């Protein structure tokens, strides 16, 4: 698929400025950073949970293993 045969688009006025007449930098601290958080806080509660869960299952798993290695002071009290 090429250009000019994509969609029947009617009534959409778009205005954009040359990159040299605008600033790429952009508006960090205004809209910039804000939205970043707007997202960390949006999906944090949807991504992190499982990873967190793994972690536990990792630690638990490891400790226990590292434990099942140490002797039961009472495997021979005699």
């Amino acid at each position: 698929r090429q250009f000019g045969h994509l969609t029947r688009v009617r009534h959409l006025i778009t205005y954009s400025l040359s990159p040299f007449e605008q600033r790429p930098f952009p508006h960090y601290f205004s809209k910039g950073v804000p939205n970043v958080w707007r997202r960390l806080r949006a999906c944090i509660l949807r991504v992190a949970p499982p990873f967190l869960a793994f972690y536990l299952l990792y630690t638990w798993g490891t400790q226990e293993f590292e434990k099942s290695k140490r002797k039961n002071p009472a495997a021979y009290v005699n």
Partner: protein
């Protein structure tokens, strides 16, 4: 020839202790045309003041207090004179064309309008809905909307960006007053010019103007003409898509110098070289204007035209084309490419023709009375005086290749243009692309 130019009657000019400048050119011609060209326009309008200059032009004829409607027209019709006119962004005029045997009568008439318009509150409330309709017509003239939108984005934010016509909301609410607030504010002698051409004898004109334009300037203000707020050019685009339309229009341009600037010549010659095409012509063999040629060979556009629309202190040097939903791209490419060629490797043999082509329009620009007055009307107003064809001649009879290059590049190379395009333009690439189309991979 050159002798033909020289033997061309100088143009007479002399201002009033009033402010008006009265100039004109004389010939044998029974007929003539005369008009007052105000330094008035849309540019001079505000956010709530936009429209007036027009809503005005539209009542500028429906009468005065001295002689109401039915009579003015009846007095005009009855004498066989044609009173027509316009209103741009920085230029408005009102010219009539009679048999020169009416200089004093036409002149009076003129004065009686630019100064006393009925502005019949009942006449207005009609012309109101008239424009609002007449505007709805200007609208499907894609051939135009594409230019306003060009202005709209080219000079975004400033006064030029506002269209001579003005928003519907203003025309829907302009007050009996606001119109007058416009008239009394801008319609003043210092910014108005009484020019004419035909069989008229300057002095007779003067005295009549000097007679019907009994204006009197007290303050220092009244005698001073305000210079306008500079308009920021803004390389950008504005796309009003609609694949529902037969075809799309595209208009791109760079900032223009302004009448004053001597380069507008060489520049004018530039536009001479690529010129314009339009399927009716008869030339896949056309003169250099490859844009033309190529436009034919590869059936690029329905029509394309180059333009250096300029104003007081700014301008719009570009090109505008109309093409099938499908060949929009190839066109730009080929076209925009030309600009480059134009100011990167243009030849003498080319400019040679360019010139002569201009020298032909240069002359035919002044074909009749009405047109001549136009220049005079204009010349003074924007340039300061009148530029004789003998002058323009030299001006552009001395532009060499290397000069065109030096110029066009100076206003086109790696400049951020403003593009405008309504219609099925899905095929027109983004900006960056038509932007990096400004520098030639030399």
């Amino acid at each position: 020839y050159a002798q033909a130019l020289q033997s061309v009657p100088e143009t007479q000019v002399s201002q009033l202790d009033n402010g008006v400048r009265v100039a004109s050119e004389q010939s044998s011609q029974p007929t003539c045309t005369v008009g007052v060209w105000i330094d008035a326009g849309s540019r001079y309008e505000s956010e709530k003041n936009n429209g007036a200059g027009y809503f005005l032009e539209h009542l500028a004829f429906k009468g005065t207090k001295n002689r109401p409607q039915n009579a003015l027209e009846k007095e005009v019709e009855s004498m066989g004179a044609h009173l027509n006119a316009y209103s741009s962004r920085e230029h408005t005029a009102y010219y009539i064309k009679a048999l020169s045997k009416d200089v004093p009568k036409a002149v009076e008439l003129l004065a009686d309008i630019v100064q006393n318009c009925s502005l019949e509150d009942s006449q207005i409330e009609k012309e109101r809905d008239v424009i609002v309709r007449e505007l709805q017509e200007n609208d499907t003239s894609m051939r135009e909307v594409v230019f306003n939108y060009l202005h709209a984005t080219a000079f975004q934010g400033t006064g030029l960006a506002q269209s001579v016509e003005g928003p519907s909301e203003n025309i829907r609410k302009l007050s009996r007053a606001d119109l007058t607030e416009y008239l009394s504010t801008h319609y003043t002698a210092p910014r108005m010019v009484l020019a004419a051409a035909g069989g008229v004898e300057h002095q007779q004109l003067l005295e009549l103007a000097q007679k019907h334009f009994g204006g009197v300037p007290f303050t220092y203000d009244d005698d001073a003409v305000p210079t306008l707020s500079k308009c920021r050019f803004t390389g950008s685009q504005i796309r009003h898509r609609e694949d529902g339309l037969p075809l799309a229009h595209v208009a791109i341009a760079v900032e223009g110098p302004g009448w004053a600037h001597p380069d507008l010549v060489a520049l004018q010659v530039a536009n001479a070289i690529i010129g314009h095409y339009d399927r009716t012509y008869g030339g896949g063999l056309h003169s250099s204007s490859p844009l033309a040629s190529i436009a034919v060979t590869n059936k690029l556009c329905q029509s394309f035209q180059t333009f250096s629309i300029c104003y007081s202190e700014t301008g719009l040097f570009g090109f505008y084309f109309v093409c099938d939903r499908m060949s929009i791209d190839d066109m730009m490419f080929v076209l925009q490419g030309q600009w480059m060629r134009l100011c990167t490797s243009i030849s003498e043999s080319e400019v040679l023709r360019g010139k002569n082509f201009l020298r032909n329009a240069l002359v035919s620009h002044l074909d009749g009375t009405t047109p001549v007055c136009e220049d005079i009307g204009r010349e003074l107003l924007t340039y300061g005086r009148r530029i004789p064809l003998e002058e323009w001649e030299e001006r552009l009879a001395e532009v060499d290749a290397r000069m065109v290059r030096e110029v066009c590049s100076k206003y086109i190379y790696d400049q951020c243009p403003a593009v405008a395009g309504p219609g099925p333009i899905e095929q027109l690439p983004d900006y960056n692309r038509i932007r990096s189309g400004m520098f030639w991979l030399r």
